C-alpha cells in the first residue's frame, strides 16, 4: 500500500546522498514531503 | 544605542531552519538602510510597513529571526504559504506585518564535499503554528506499527541535512533569511527609526 513505496523512496533519497547525488537527494526529499502530506 | 543589525546579517554562521534563531532588538536607534544595502538581496518583502516608512517609526521590540534554507524554499517564508518549510520548520502567521529578507549565501555556506551542518525537518505529524520552534528528535512513526524510539521500517529520523555544495543549481543553493517582526505593546517604544521624534 502507501508504506512500501514510502520506504523505497526514503532509501533512494539516502542512497542518492551517499553516492554524491546530493541534489537528486534533495529532490526526492521534496517528493516525500509531497507524498506524506497527501491522502 | 545603535541597533545591532550588522551582527544579525553579518554573523559568521546562521542557524538551521528547524532550530531557527531569534534575536531581540531593544533600546536602540535603527537606520534601516545599513540593512537595505548590507548585501544584494534576492528577497525583501515587507507586509505591514515599508522600509522608508520604518525610519520614522518606533516599536517596543524588534525580533530578527534568522536561518538558512534552499533558494527554492525562500518563497515559503511568506504568509499563507504551505510546504516543507512552512509546514514543519518556520511558519509565518497570515496577519504578519514585518519584513522577510533573503540573500544567496552559496559562498559562505556551501562546501566542496557538502555542508551537512545545516538541517531541516522532513517529517511531522502536523503543521507548526505561527512562530513555533520544534527542536524535537522523536523518531517519526509512518505506519500502523509503533516505533518505540527505534529507527527503521516506517520509522524515520525526522531531520535531514542540506549538504550544500557550490556547484548545485541556485534553487538548491543556501540562502540566508532574516525575518523582522515589529512589536507594538502598551509600553514605551524603545526601538526607533532614525528620522523619528
Ligand atoms: Na520557491
Residue numbers in the entry:
A (entry chain A): 1 to 39
B (entry chain B): 334 to 530
What does the paper say about this structure?
The spike protein of the SARS-CoV-2 binds to human angiotensin-converting enzyme 2 (ACE2) through the receptor-binding domain (RBD) and changes the conformation to fuse the viral and cell membranes, mediating viral entry.
First, the main-chain structure of the ACE2-binding site is invariant to form the backbone of the binding site, though amino acid substitutions alter the side chain. Superimposition of the crystal structures confirmed that the RBD main chain of the binding interface was perfectly aligned, and the main-chain structures on RBD surfaces were invariant among various mutants. L3, Q7, E23, L26, and Y33 of CeSPIACE recognize the main-chain structure of RBD around A475-G476, N487, Y501-G502, Y495, and G416-N417, respectively, fitting into the groove between side chains. CeSPIACE was designed to interact with Y473, A475, N487, and Y489 via L3, L6, Q7, Y10, and M36; with R498 via G20; and with Y501 and G502 via G22, E23, and L26. Mutation mapping on the structure showed that most mutations of the Omicron subvariants were outside the CeSPIACE-binding site, but R403K, F456L, N460K, F486S/V/I/P, and R493Q were on the binding site. FSEC analyses showed that CeSPIACE can also potently bind to these binding-site mutations. The F486 mutations tended to reduce the ACE2 affinity but did not affect the CeSPIACE affinity because CeSPIACE recognizes the RBD main chain through L3 and Q7 whereas ACE2 primarily interacts with the F486 side chain.
